[PDB]
Amino acid sequence: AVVKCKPTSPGRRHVVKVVNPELHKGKPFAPLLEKNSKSGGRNNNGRITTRHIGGGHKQAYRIVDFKRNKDGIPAVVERLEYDPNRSANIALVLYKDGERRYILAPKGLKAGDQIQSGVDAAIKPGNTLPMRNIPVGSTVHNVEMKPGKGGQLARSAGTYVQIVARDGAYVTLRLRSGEMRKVEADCRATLGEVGNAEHMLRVLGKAGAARWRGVRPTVRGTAMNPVDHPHGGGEGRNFGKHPVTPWGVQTKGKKTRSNKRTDKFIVRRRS
Amino acid sequence: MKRTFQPSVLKRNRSHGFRARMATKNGRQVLARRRAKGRARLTVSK
Amino acid sequence: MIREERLLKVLRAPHVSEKASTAMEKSNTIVLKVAKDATKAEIKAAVQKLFEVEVEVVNTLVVKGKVKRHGQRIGRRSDWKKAYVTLKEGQNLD
RNA sequence: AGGACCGAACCGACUAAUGUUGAAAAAUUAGCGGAUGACUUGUGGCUGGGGGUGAAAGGCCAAUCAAACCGGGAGAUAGCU
RNA sequence: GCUCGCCGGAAGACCAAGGGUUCCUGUCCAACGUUAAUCGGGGCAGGGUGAGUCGACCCCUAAGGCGAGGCCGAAAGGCGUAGUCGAUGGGAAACAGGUUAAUAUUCCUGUACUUGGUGUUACUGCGAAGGGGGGACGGAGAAGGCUAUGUUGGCCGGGCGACGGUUGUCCCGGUUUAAGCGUGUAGGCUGGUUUUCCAGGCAAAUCCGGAAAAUCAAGGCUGAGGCGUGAUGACGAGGCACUACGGUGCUGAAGCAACAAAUGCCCUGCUUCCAGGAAAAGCCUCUAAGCAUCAGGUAACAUCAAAUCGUACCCCAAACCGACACAGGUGGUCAGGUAGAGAAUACCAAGGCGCUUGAGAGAACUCGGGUGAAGGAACUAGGCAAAAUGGUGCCGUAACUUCGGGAGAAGGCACGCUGAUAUGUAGGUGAGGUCCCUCGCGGAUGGAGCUGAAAUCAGUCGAAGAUACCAGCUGGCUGCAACUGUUUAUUAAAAACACAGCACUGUGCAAACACGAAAGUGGACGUAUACGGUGUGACGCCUGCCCGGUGCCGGAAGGUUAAUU
Ligand SMILES: [Mg+2]
Ligand SMILES: [Mg+2]
Ligand SMILES: [Mg+2]
Ligand SMILES: [Mg+2]
Ligand SMILES: [Mg+2]
Ligand SMILES: [Mg+2]
Ligand SMILES: [Mg+2]
Ligand SMILES: [Mg+2]
Ligand SMILES: [Mg+2]
Ligand SMILES: [Mg+2]
Ligand SMILES: [Mg+2]
Ligand SMILES: [Mg+2]
Ligand SMILES: [Mg+2]
Ligand SMILES: [Mg+2]
Ligand SMILES: [Mg+2]
Ligand SMILES: [Mg+2]
Ligand SMILES: [Mg+2]
Ligand SMILES: [Mg+2]
Ligand SMILES: [Mg+2]
Ligand SMILES: [Mg+2]
Ligand SMILES: [Mg+2]
Ligand SMILES: [Mg+2]
Ligand SMILES: [Mg+2]
Ligand SMILES: [Mg+2]
Ligand SMILES: [Mg+2]
Ligand SMILES: [Mg+2]
Ligand SMILES: [Mg+2]
Ligand SMILES: [Mg+2]
Ligand SMILES: [Mg+2]
Ligand SMILES: [Mg+2]
Ligand SMILES: [Mg+2]
Ligand SMILES: [Mg+2]
Ligand SMILES: [Mg+2]
Ligand SMILES: [Mg+2]
Ligand SMILES: [Mg+2]
Ligand SMILES: [Mg+2]
Ligand SMILES: [Mg+2]
Ligand SMILES: [Mg+2]
Ligand SMILES: [Mg+2]
Ligand SMILES: [Mg+2]
Ligand SMILES: [Mg+2]
Ligand SMILES: [Mg+2]
Ligand SMILES: [Mg+2]
Ligand SMILES: [Mg+2]
Ligand SMILES: [Mg+2]
Ligand SMILES: [Mg+2]
Ligand SMILES: [Mg+2]
Ligand SMILES: [Mg+2]
Ligand SMILES: [Mg+2]
Ligand SMILES: [Mg+2]
Ligand SMILES: [Mg+2]
Ligand SMILES: [Mg+2]
Ligand SMILES: [Mg+2]
Ligand SMILES: [Mg+2]
Ligand SMILES: [Mg+2]
Ligand SMILES: [Mg+2]
Ligand SMILES: [Mg+2]
Ligand SMILES: [Mg+2]
Ligand SMILES: [Mg+2]
Ligand SMILES: [Mg+2]
Ligand SMILES: [Mg+2]
Ligand SMILES: [Mg+2]
Ligand SMILES: [Mg+2]
Ligand SMILES: [Mg+2]
Ligand SMILES: [Mg+2]
Ligand SMILES: [Mg+2]
Ligand SMILES: [Mg+2]
Ligand SMILES: [Mg+2]
Ligand SMILES: [Mg+2]
């Protein structure tokens, strides 16, 4: 649930927590963990390639299963867990054969729930099956774009995709953006919405919170000198130019999709 | 006042020492130049 | 097994000094100048063969050379290895 | 509980007088701000010059910065002194 | 040498880094030392650094570096796989005393430990580049148990006072002892043991994981400290022999108890929070290829082994970074007493220093301080600077408010010492005795002794009792920025930047975008509740009209329009 924190200090006043009690209070499943060091938004050349990334808390990498290939073995959900690497919550499941995996926790899922991957599997939340097997009109998440690859669409805290149509070897998805997109019908998909839907109701409430999430501050181009950004300079507050990136490209409105290889799959762009 | 030079031997060696110089082409060139000049101490190496 | 030839080369001199004398008298320990490359075992071997005397143990150390000035010109003395060699109880050395 | 409060260490640098061929090429003494954090600090690492880095002052990049230093083109050119 | 003064969370002690002989001894005083110098971190000579257990090396890895092939690139070269390097992190082992002019966990004395071989007898499934476990981990908070350490008493040794008193409830000193081995406690974690099966752990697995079934409620792991031993020893106040006045040799009493007590240890624990908290080896275990009655494994016992390099000295400084013997800078560890909340402050201990020019004088003026009649901001751009306020407890406290605040609002009262309450209370601690007992570091009862606030009443001294040091000035109206933060190293700390929040806009994943002739990398092991860019800047009430201009978005009928032909 969302919880507005009492204003016992400024910087706590405007804080709203999203507190789920059903998460595992404990150390995560250590076999599925692995190291994940921070970039600082800097590439192999050592240059900053993406501004405003830096610091934040140490995090392990939970190895989430997005491919979801244990066909026919029924799994049972052991627990829901906090993943620092994503807006969703993950769920530690236990297959009948003794293997454990992390998956994206879907909306209704909780400890004890049984889930299943495969063509044969029951059309119920958390179950995973090819989109030719999934009924049209259903909400799905963790959608593969290429068969066998692993789920790429609808992974974020409260997302889901609608299967609007199945026309032969393809199905048309209504993506969360509003883009309608053709996808091969043999591509896999998990039933239902992804879990942590009140994630968006959280409000950080202070500068420090942002920092804790590894986000360094962002300086406004207009606050700079002309040598630094296109918006810089001016005595007092001036801004007599069309908005643009730090590299001079228009920012308010100018479209930047150039991919002519996948234009065929996009049925309708978002609006 | 913390002045600019704050010595550290390992750091010095890694930065400027013989092996570092050797490692790259420009470093090698520098060494060669030094040799030509007649430098007694070819590198920072003690 | 150290070579005879090697052994002969190892041991450079006896070291005369107050401390050395004291060591000799009290602790039955002789203070030698040895080759800088000479390991402890080798030194011991040399002692046993060349002085005919049982060795309890050898402690070594490296003495660093002093920097001196002969007139205007600066110059460093050589480093050299000192060895305290402790002889077994009752071993009297000439 | 807290980018909560008072306050030493620690980090800073608002006022003052002193110094200004200094004790010091930015310090002093007296007060002053922060002091569980967007904190501070050791060791090592990475980013290189129209390049880096910048909670943005054209700041900082070895007492050097509206384009570092070293060497070279080079005895640049100087209707000027 | 005797006084005096200063530091004492340091101006003391021990290290790292850095330096590199500055250490110690003798000797010399030209230069160096802001003066003299017999002295010196100066000159010259000699001496000095001892390790299986400390550190490096070594084994393991992090960020990152290099990188066979490889991919990419006019050349140079870039990126990167296998790998291999890389500590600031993980990995076996030593303590006490004694000694040098100068080293010591390194020498000596005592008492220990480790992991390797080799050989043994005893046994008999061993075996990895692989599987599993483990190592292995955050912040804050709270205690409880402890010790370091200190205080008092007892004990032991010495003392009987340069001036009134001082054979006592008097004075001074000491009262120390390790690792190791054994015990396995306060306490923490977990249900164990056996059997059967199984699409999992790249193959196999007797291991792990998962299913069942049986049976027993104690099983195991962890763990400070204490106690015992170690120790008939060592050390020991000071006494006693020699004396090159440096010291050397002999000798040696007591060596207990209580209370207080860490920020250290149990604790890598527990509780809790969200921001969700390295890796790999050593270590344990499982098997595969294999070998097969051999090796290898564990078992004690014997023996051999542990090389190499560092070890002086300075290390908040006269030895390092600052040109200087420079008011500067410099990470870690140690942390006594009285007062105190305290690592603040004051005075002291241990220990270390008086800052390498002195001597006079006692003008103006300058610096740093003290006090000041009457007035009290009249000063001045401005109360700048000074002055003042300043503690604990209790009473009391407005507007306004986002209901948290405002607030330590404001303002007041009490405060010492003595006695009594109470030859020391409330509390804390807790010995004998007595009882129980699955027997121990056990449980009950018991209260000796020890420690010990706070209050009330009564008296009492002073001008003054938070007496020194230490230690808020307060209130009223108002601009700006919500707030904590950041910034021009060295004339600007702000109203500037940032900020949570808001909006627009791009981006469907080989994402947009960015760094790269490219390969590739970041974005992100993220996927539209996400990421980028732009503006605005908490919260509240809001955010009007204009698309002609310039941009952007969409359109494509016509006009115009490149290479090409
Ligand atoms: Mg951003
Ligand atoms: Mg923003
Ligand atoms: Mg901004
Ligand atoms: Mg500006
Ligand atoms: Mg421009
Ligand atoms: Mg203007
Ligand atoms: Mg205008
Ligand atoms: Mg040695
Ligand atoms: Mg605070
Ligand atoms: Mg404060
Ligand atoms: Mg600053
Ligand atoms: Mg000051
Ligand atoms: Mg340039
Ligand atoms: Mg400007
Ligand atoms: Mg500079
Ligand atoms: Mg230029
Ligand atoms: Mg020319
Ligand atoms: Mg010229
Ligand atoms: Mg004093
Ligand atoms: Mg010298
Ligand atoms: Mg000396
Ligand atoms: Mg001398
Ligand atoms: Mg002189
Ligand atoms: Mg003279
Ligand atoms: Mg000298
Ligand atoms: Mg020895
Ligand atoms: Mg060791
Ligand atoms: Mg690497
Ligand atoms: Mg490479
Ligand atoms: Mg190659
Ligand atoms: Mg290695
Ligand atoms: Mg290390
Ligand atoms: Mg180590
Ligand atoms: Mg010494
Ligand atoms: Mg393993
Ligand atoms: Mg913690
Ligand atoms: Mg004690
Ligand atoms: Mg003790
Ligand atoms: Mg008297
Ligand atoms: Mg008298
Ligand atoms: Mg006494
Ligand atoms: Mg013991
Ligand atoms: Mg030493
Ligand atoms: Mg000191
Ligand atoms: Mg001086
Ligand atoms: Mg100094
Ligand atoms: Mg104290
Ligand atoms: Mg003090
Ligand atoms: Mg002086
Ligand atoms: Mg005067
Ligand atoms: Mg005054
Ligand atoms: Mg007056
Ligand atoms: Mg008077
Ligand atoms: Mg008056
Ligand atoms: Mg006037
Ligand atoms: Mg006036
Ligand atoms: Mg003032
Ligand atoms: Mg004052
Ligand atoms: Mg006004
Ligand atoms: Mg502000
Ligand atoms: Mg800063
Ligand atoms: Mg400034
Ligand atoms: Mg200033
Ligand atoms: Mg990519
Ligand atoms: Mg603004
Ligand atoms: Mg408007
Ligand atoms: Mg328009
Ligand atoms: Mg129009
Ligand atoms: Mg157009």
Swiss-Prot record, chain A:
The modification N6-acetyllysine is found at K241. GO terms for cellular component: cytoplasm; cytosol; cytosolic large ribosomal subunit; DnaA-L2 complex. Gene3D superfamilies: 2.30.30.30, Nucleic acid-binding proteins (2.40.50.140), Ribosomal protein L2, domain 3 (4.10.950.10). Residues 38-47 have a biased composition (Low complexity). InterPro entries: NA-bd_OB-fold (IPR012340), Rib_uL2_dom2 (IPR014722), Ribosomal_uL2 (IPR002171), Ribosomal_uL2_bac/org-type (IPR005880), Ribosomal_uL2_C (IPR022669), Ribosomal_uL2_CS (IPR022671), Ribosomal_uL2_dom3 (IPR014726), Ribosomal_uL2_RNA-bd_dom (IPR022666). One of its GO terms (biological process) is ribosomal large subunit assembly. SUPFAM superfamilies: Nucleic acid-binding proteins (SSF50249), Translation proteins SH3-like domain (SSF50104). Residues 27-52, 220-271 are annotated as: Disordered. Keywords: Acetylation, Ribonucleoprotein, Ribosomal protein, RNA-binding, rRNA-binding. One of its GO terms (molecular function) is structural constituent of ribosome. PROSITE patterns: RIBOSOMAL_L2. Signal peptide: none annotated. Pfam families: Ribosomal_L2, Ribosomal_L2_C. Belongs to the universal ribosomal protein uL2 family. One of the primary rRNA binding proteins. Located near the base of the L1 stalk, it is probably also mobile. Required for association of the 30S and 50S subunits to form the 70S ribosome, for tRNA binding and peptide bond formation. It has been suggested to have peptidyltransferase activity; this is highly controversial. In the E.coli 70S ribosome in the initiation state it has been modeled to make several contacts with the 16S rRNA (forming bridge B7b, PubMed:12809609); these contacts are broken in the model with bound EF-G. Part of the 50S ribosomal subunit. Forms a bridge to the 30S subunit in the 70S ribosome, contacting the 16S rRNA. Interacts weakly with S6 in one of the 3.5 A resolved structures. In pull-down experiments interacts with CedA. This protein can be partially replaced in vivo by its H.marismortui (HmaL2) or human (L8, from the 60S cytoplasmic ribosome) homolog.
From Swiss-Prot, chain B:
Signal peptide: none annotated. Disulfide bonds: none annotated. GO terms for cellular component: cytoplasm; cytosolic large ribosomal subunit. Pfam families: Ribosomal_L34. Part of the 50S ribosomal subunit. The keyword Ribosomal protein applies. PROSITE patterns: RIBOSOMAL_L34 (PS00784). This is Large ribosomal subunit protein bL34. Keywords: Ribonucleoprotein, Ribosomal protein. One of its GO terms (biological process) is cytoplasmic translation. One of its GO terms (molecular function) is structural constituent of ribosome. InterPro entries: Ribosomal_bL34, Ribosomal_bL34_CS. It comes from the Bacteria. Belongs to the bacterial ribosomal protein bL34 family. The lineage of its organism: Bacteria, Pseudomonadati, Pseudomonadota, Gammaproteobacteria, Enterobacterales. It comes from Escherichia coli (strain K12). The keyword Ribosomal protein applies.
Curated annotation (Swiss-Prot), chain C:
GO terms for molecular function: rRNA binding; structural constituent of ribosome. It comes from the Bacteria. The keyword Amino-acid biosynthesis does not apply. Keywords: Ribonucleoprotein, Ribosomal protein, RNA-binding, rRNA-binding. The keyword Ribosomal protein applies. Transmembrane segments: none annotated. GO terms for cellular component: cytoplasm; cytosolic large ribosomal subunit. Belongs to the universal ribosomal protein uL23 family. One of the early assembly proteins, it binds 23S rRNA; is essential for growth. One of the proteins that surround the polypeptide exit tunnel on the outside of the subunit. Acts as the docking site for trigger factor for Ffh binding to the ribosome (SRP54) and to nascent polypeptide chains. PANTHER family: 60S RIBOSOMAL PROTEIN L23A. This is Large ribosomal subunit protein uL23. The lineage of its organism: Bacteria, Pseudomonadati, Pseudomonadota, Gammaproteobacteria, Enterobacterales. The gene is rplW.
